[PDB]
Amino acid sequence: ELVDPLTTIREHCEQTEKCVKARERLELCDARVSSRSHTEEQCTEELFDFLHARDHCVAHKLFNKLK
Amino acid sequence: GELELHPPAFPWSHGGPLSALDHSSVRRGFQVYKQVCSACHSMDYVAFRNLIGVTHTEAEAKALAEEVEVQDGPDENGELFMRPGKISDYFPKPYPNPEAARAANNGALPPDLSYIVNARHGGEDYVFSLLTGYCDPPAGVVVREGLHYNPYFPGQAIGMAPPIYNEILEYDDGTPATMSQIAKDVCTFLRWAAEPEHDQRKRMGLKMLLISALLTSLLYYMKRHKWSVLKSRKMAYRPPK
Amino acid sequence: NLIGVTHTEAEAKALAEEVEVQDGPDENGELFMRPGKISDYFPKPYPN
Amino acid sequence: AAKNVVTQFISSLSASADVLALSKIEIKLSDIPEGKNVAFKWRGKPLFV
Amino acid sequence: ALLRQAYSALFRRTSTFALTVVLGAVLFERAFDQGADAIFEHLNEGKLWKHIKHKYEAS
Amino acid sequence: GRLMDRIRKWYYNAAGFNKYGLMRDDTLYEDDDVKEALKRLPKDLYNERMFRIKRALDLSLKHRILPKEQWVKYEEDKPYLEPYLKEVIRERLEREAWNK
Amino acid sequence: GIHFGNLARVRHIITYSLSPFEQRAIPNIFSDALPNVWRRFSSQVFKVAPPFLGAYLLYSWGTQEFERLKRKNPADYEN
Amino acid sequence: ANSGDFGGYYCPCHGSHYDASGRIRKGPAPYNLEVPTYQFVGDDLVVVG
Amino acid sequence: APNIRKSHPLLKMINNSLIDLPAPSNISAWWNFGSLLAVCLMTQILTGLLLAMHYTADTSLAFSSVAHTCRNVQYGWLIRNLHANGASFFFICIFLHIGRGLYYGSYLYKETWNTGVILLLTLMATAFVGYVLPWGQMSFWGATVITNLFSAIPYIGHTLVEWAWGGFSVDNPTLTRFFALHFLLPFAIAGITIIHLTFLHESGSNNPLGISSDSDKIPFHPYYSFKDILGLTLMLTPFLTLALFSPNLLGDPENFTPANPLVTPPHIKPEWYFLFAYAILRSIPNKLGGVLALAASVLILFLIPFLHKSKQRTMTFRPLSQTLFWLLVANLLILTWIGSQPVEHPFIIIGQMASLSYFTILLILFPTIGTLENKMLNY
Numbered sequence A: 001e002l003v004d005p006l007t008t009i010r011e012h013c014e015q016t017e018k019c020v021k022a023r024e025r026l027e028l029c030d031a032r033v034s035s036r037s038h039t040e041e042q043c044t045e046e047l048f049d050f051l052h053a054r055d056h057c058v059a060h061k062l063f064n065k066l067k
Numbered sequence B: 001g002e003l004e005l006h007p008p009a010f011p012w013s014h015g016g017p018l019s020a021l022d023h024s025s026v027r028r029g030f031q032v033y034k035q036v037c038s039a040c041h042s043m044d045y046v047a048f049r050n051l052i053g054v055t056h057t058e059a060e061a062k063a064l065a066e067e068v069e070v071q072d073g074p075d076e077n078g079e080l081f082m083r084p085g086k087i088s089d090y091f092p093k094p095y096p097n098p099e100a101a102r103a104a105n106n107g108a109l110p111p112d113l114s115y116i117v118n119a120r121h122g123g124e125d126y127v128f129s130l131l132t133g134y135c136d137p138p139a140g141v142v143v144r145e146g147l148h149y150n151p152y153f154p155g156q157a158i159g160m161a162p163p164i165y166n167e168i169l170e171y172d173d174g175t176p177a178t179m180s181q182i183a184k185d186v187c188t189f190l191r192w193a194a195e196p197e198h199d200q201r202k203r204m205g206l207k208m209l210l211i212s213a214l215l216t217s218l219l220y221y222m223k224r225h226k227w228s229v230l231k232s233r234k235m236a237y238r239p240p241k
Numbered sequence C: 001n002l003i004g005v006t007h008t009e010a011e012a013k014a015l016a017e018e019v020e021v022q023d024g025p026d027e028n029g030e031l032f033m034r035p036g037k038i039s040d041y042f043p044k045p046y047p048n
Numbered sequence D: 001a002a003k004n005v006v007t008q009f010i011s012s013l014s015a016s017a018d019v020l021a022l023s024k025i026e027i028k029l030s031d032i033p034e035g036k037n038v039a040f041k042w043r044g045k046p047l048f049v
Numbered sequence E: 001a002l003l004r005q006a007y008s009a010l011f012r013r014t015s016t017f018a019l020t021v022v023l024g025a026v027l028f029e030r031a032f033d034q035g036a037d038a039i040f041e042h043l044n045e046g047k048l049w050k051h052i053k054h055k056y057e058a059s
Numbered sequence F: 001g002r003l004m005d006r007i008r009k010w011y012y013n014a015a016g017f018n019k020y021g022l023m024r025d026d027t028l029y030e031d032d033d034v035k036e037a038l039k040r041l042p043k044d045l046y047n048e049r050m051f052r053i054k055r056a057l058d059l060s061l062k063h064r065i066l067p068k069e070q071w072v073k074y075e076e077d078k079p080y081l082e083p084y085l086k087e088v089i090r091e092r093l094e095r096e097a098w099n100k
Numbered sequence G: 001g002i003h004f005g006n007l008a009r010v011r012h013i014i015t016y017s018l019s020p021f022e023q024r025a026i027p028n029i030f031s032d033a034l035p036n037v038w039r040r041f042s043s044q045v046f047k048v049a050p051p052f053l054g055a056y057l058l059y060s061w062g063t064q065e066f067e068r069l070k071r072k073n074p075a076d077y078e079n
Numbered sequence H: 001a002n003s004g005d006f007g008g009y010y011c012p013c014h015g016s017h018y019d020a021s022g023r024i025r026k027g028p029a030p031y032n033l034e035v036p037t038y039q040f041v042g043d044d045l046v047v048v049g
Numbered sequence I: 001a002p003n004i005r006k007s008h009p010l011l012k013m014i015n016n017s018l019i020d021l022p023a024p025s026n027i028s029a030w031w032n033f034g035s036l037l038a039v040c041l042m043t044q045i046l047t048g049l050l051l052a053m054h055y056t057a058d059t060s061l062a063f064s065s066v067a068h069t070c071r072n073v074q075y076g077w078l079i080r081n082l083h084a085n086g087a088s089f090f091f092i093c094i095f096l097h098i099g100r101g102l103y104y105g106s107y108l109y110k111e112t113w114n115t116g117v118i119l120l121l122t123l124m125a126t127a128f129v130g131y132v133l134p135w136g137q138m139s140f141w142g143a144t145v146i147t148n149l150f151s152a153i154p155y156i157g158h159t160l161v162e163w164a165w166g167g168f169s170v171d172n173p174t175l176t177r178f179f180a181l182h183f184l185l186p187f188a189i190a191g192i193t194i195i196h197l198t199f200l201h202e203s204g205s206n207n208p209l210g211i212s213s214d215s216d217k218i219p220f221h222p223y224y225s226f227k228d229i230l231g232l233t234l235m236l237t238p239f240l241t242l243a244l245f246s247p248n249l250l251g252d253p254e255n256f257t258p259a260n261p262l263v264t265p266p267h268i269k270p271e272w273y274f275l276f277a278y279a280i281l282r283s284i285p286n287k288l289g290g291v292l293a294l295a296a297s298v299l300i301l302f303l304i305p306f307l308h309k310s311k312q313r314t315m316t317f318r319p320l321s322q323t324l325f326w327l328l329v330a331n332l333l334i335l336t337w338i339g340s341q342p343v344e345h346p347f348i349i350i351g352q353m354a355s356l357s358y359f360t361i362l363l364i365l366f367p368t369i370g371t372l373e374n375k376m377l378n379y
């Protein structure tokens, strides 16, 4: 039991405004879509927007902690 | 999926136009390949001798290569026989042909990873994120049975089961085998594996830039020097009158 | 090669079908035997 | 003479004689669920089913 | 004056001009190589096999 | 009207062959007609055209131009060849239509 | 193959020039060189840049408009 | 297959859109996909030659 | 008798075309590309042989031989790099060498020009075949699309292709005969280059001012021999900088995957130097149209000499033409970019336009501005 600096910083970043702002947009997409069947919509976009902002952030620090 | 998510830009220790590979992260990456990937992924253009002088000692490699039984022959009766591996052999295929591999991975073909780093838009940057980035499908996305979600992979339905997880193996140099720490080392290896010259390539580059700087200037002189005669020249039209 | 020279198209087909050749791999990656087609070369009596 | 030597040489480029016979195919309509497509190594070029 | 001594014993006689570029280049190489190798092995400290070498070279 | 006339002057300063001291007809491309014309030039007018060009060439090689005060001015530009040329051409036009 | 001598008829032109060894490598880098390097740049940037800039724009638009058409319009899902 | 504006095919080389019938619908392409002369045999089988 | 540099039936040549050669005292740097192109050719050929000495033209070993050459041959890798990119550096140089000609109307030296065109055409073809040798995914699919182009001609169409492939579809016979082609063509270029230069030497070089230069010429040596050695090193730096610091910048990576006659890749682009063509072929939505537009997109060069209407030779003194010229250049830059992009809006329409504008600037705007210009000088 040890901690992968990744999941530690993946946390930290999800706090940056950019992240939350997109994190929320998704939370919402996820909701309207999950609660409705005979759709078409998908929350990929919203997700990417998120992962995009998130990981981009992860990228700036992650390697400092890795060996 | 008309849409796609592109990867970020990690500052690999060797990214700079003068930065050599991390010959230690490579030795590790290797171990990661040897102990994890080499069960589905072929490395046909690399061979144990390549390691010598780069990540392992001559003695080590010999032993390394002897941990495998290869198919040599025919003998004197004409039978193919197994024999221990020599430094001159290439890394063993996990399958006898693509037809087989597919069948043992759900019709999916785990591509040889020799030039992989250079065959996917993004290189080591992409290979890293694919490895780490595995996750759950967002709202409205159904991933066919046998396929896992991965936002980084095109189509997001990748036939490769997430290959790494903390402690999945244990480096002999005493390094924290966290998911990324591995994915960093293996991605670093792939690079070396994909263009072993890399180092000597950048070293020359430097040398080139240095001669090329000096020599270009030295000639800017000799071009002007000679031309001066025509640039300083003056002429006049003196008719009869 | 026999066709048009010593044998008829029909004959050769049959002639070549009198032998089992090694084609493959298949779907699972196994080498399987199959009847001969006019496009095969005469069979080696030894593997090497 | 000339016309025949050019003919001769020129067909040296066209298809060879080792250009196979063709026609062969084994297919289980059952392996293909409804709504999907598959590629088969047929007579040189792909074949969609 | 160096330039004069230079021009007299070197750059003048076409025969010795050449003889210089030769014995000259020689030194240049020898020297240049060292530098670049050093400037390089230095910018990549502890990352070259030449640096890791002793951790396995049983000696 | 006095438009083409205020236009031409512009274009003239625009092409800027004056910056090199070259008259309008110094920059003419030398086809067969021009060639012919140039040969009909009075001893001097030719030796003069010559200098101007060998001087302009010397400029283009040095990458410089003439100081503002030596440039040709739209109205002081002598069309020393235009007449000789129109004659060559006029002459030729004849021979051509006559050969039918 | 000889072209030097049969070229053209020139009269009354005097030219003077100096041995390279007598003159400077590159002279007046500031009192003459640069100030001319500029002039040139000046006079030509107005014929060249325009259309290039014109392209740049078109490139960005085309690109920006394309990435825009990839996003999703809510008005199709608010139903 | 599984791309395009006609639920059939798409050729990324110069953008030709094919439908589920393999018929050419949009793009530079000019003729419909060739079709092999084939036949059915059993419940879940089929062969061409 | 007197000197052994003008009477030796051989030495006289190197001296009659490379030393005493009379050159306008004022040709710029856009005249340098001439040599570079030459040095470029001779250089490609060297790396070329060196390479060919390890390649093995045969589908089942083409790809692997190139890798073995890189990985196992001493400095092999480097040797490929230089060759692979030299091609670009080559196309680059040739491109300016053509623009130089357009701007200063060198195209009035018809023969010297037309040969040039042929030369281009050959280089183009040459690179095409070379690119297929490594038998990669593009190699294949490229070899498959390009040759297929001739199938646009009716009757002898489908049939002509057969020779090309040497089969009923791209396979070994194609590869091996391409290797032959590639090995041979360069030499033909070197040959025509000789005619090209030889035609030029009847008239002397053109020059930036577009007027007689007899009034003052200088020996190629040491004026231009020196100017060129420098020019060479100024262009050589970036080209080495790429082939030493970013080998794969200009190169598609999809071609790192062994050809698969069963899967055409999703993101298919030819190497940069063929994009503008690519764009035009893709602009017209018709097999034949696209081909034709393509065919003319380059074959038009043969016309440039008959579309000259200005009374002057160079554009130096024709601002209008100049702006139109730079508009054309940029116009081209776009077309290229467009080729780099997939067939979708807006791209499709943008492509379509740029093409129209390309052809139009050459066929109508240049001859029209050209005339107008004259009347504004009062001729």
Ligand code: HEC
Binding pocket: B032, B033, B036, B037, B038, B039, B040, B041, B105, B108, B109, B110, B111, B116, B120, B127, B130, B131, B157, B158, B159, B160, B161, B163, B164, B186
């Ligand atoms: C369980 C077998 C298995 C193991 C072990 C495995 N992979 Fe894979 N891998 C696959 C499969 C299957 C695919 C093909 C995915 C597809 O095309 O649907 C694949 C594909 C890949 C791809 C990307 C393919 C693409 O098109 O982008 C990479 C990169 C890769 N694997 C890396 C690794 C690495 C690194 C490791 C070792 C640390 C590893 N794999 C271990 C099965 C595996």
Ligand code: HEM
Binding pocket: I030, I031, I032, I033, I034, I035, I037, I038, I041, I094, I097, I098, I101, I104, I105, I106, I107, I109, I112, I113, I114, I115, I116, I117, I118, I119, I120, I123, I189, I193, I196, I197, I200, I204, I205, I206, I207, I301
């Ligand atoms: C392998 C092909 C080519 C090579 C190596 C080559 C080489 C040369 C050389 C050495 C020169 C003389 C110096 C110079 O003016 O640059 C020259 C001149 C010239 N070339 Fe090329 N050339 C090639 C292709 C072309 C092409 C494709 C064109 C355009 C269709 C062309 C058109 C010309 C013209 C017009 C000149 C006259 C130069 C002038 O205006 O003074 N060349 N070429």
Ligand code: HEM
Binding pocket: I041, I044, I045, I046, I047, I048, I049, I051, I052, I053, I055, I066, I080, I083, I084, I087, I090, I123, I126, I127, I128, I129, I130, I131, I132, I133, I134, I182, I183, I184, I185, I186, I187, I189
């Ligand atoms: C005419 C100038 C030349 C051009 C424009 C040229 C261009 C190219 C191109 C585009 C490739 C593919 C490069 C790649 O794999 O990325 C290539 C490959 C090759 N060329 Fe050339 N080439 C030239 C001349 C030659 C010559 C003269 C030979 C020797 C006869 C040669 C031998 C080869 C070989 C062996 C390959 C295959 C190996 C490889 O791809 O690296 N080439 N060339």
Ligand SMILES: COC(=O)CNC(=O)CCC/C=C\NC(=O)c1ccc(Cc2ccc(I)cc2)cc1
Binding pocket: H013, I124, I125, I127, I128, I131, I138, I139, I141, I142, I143, I145, I146, I268, I269, I270, I271, I274, I277, I278, I281, I294
């Ligand atoms: C360097 O080689 C390449 O770039 C070839 N590879 C590719 O084009 C890879 C992608 C293949 C798919 C489409 N290509 C084209 O449509 C294409 C069309 C025209 C050209 C120019 C060209 C024409 C004839 C001739 I002859 C030559 C060129 C080149 C490519």
Ligand SMILES: CCCCCCCCO[C@@H]1O[C@H](CO)[C@@H](O)[C@H](O)[C@H]1O
Binding pocket: B200
């Ligand atoms: C005594 C003669 C010995 C010749 C040995 C040839 C081995 C070549 O050794 C070379 O040394 C270089 C050092 O700068 C490295 O950069 C190269 O990668 C390596 O191949």
Ligand SMILES: CCCCCCCCO[C@@H]1O[C@H](CO)[C@@H](O)[C@H](O)[C@H]1O
Binding pocket: D001, D004, D005, D007, D008
């Ligand atoms: C100078 C000598 C010229 C030799 C010309 C002989 C031409 C060969 O003629 C050949 O004869 C074969 C046998 O019938 C045919 O099958 C070929 O199609 C035909 O081209």
Ligand code: FES
Binding pocket: H011, H012, H013, H014, H015, H016, H027, H028, H029, I145
């Ligand atoms: S080959 Fe299919 S769109 Fe051109």
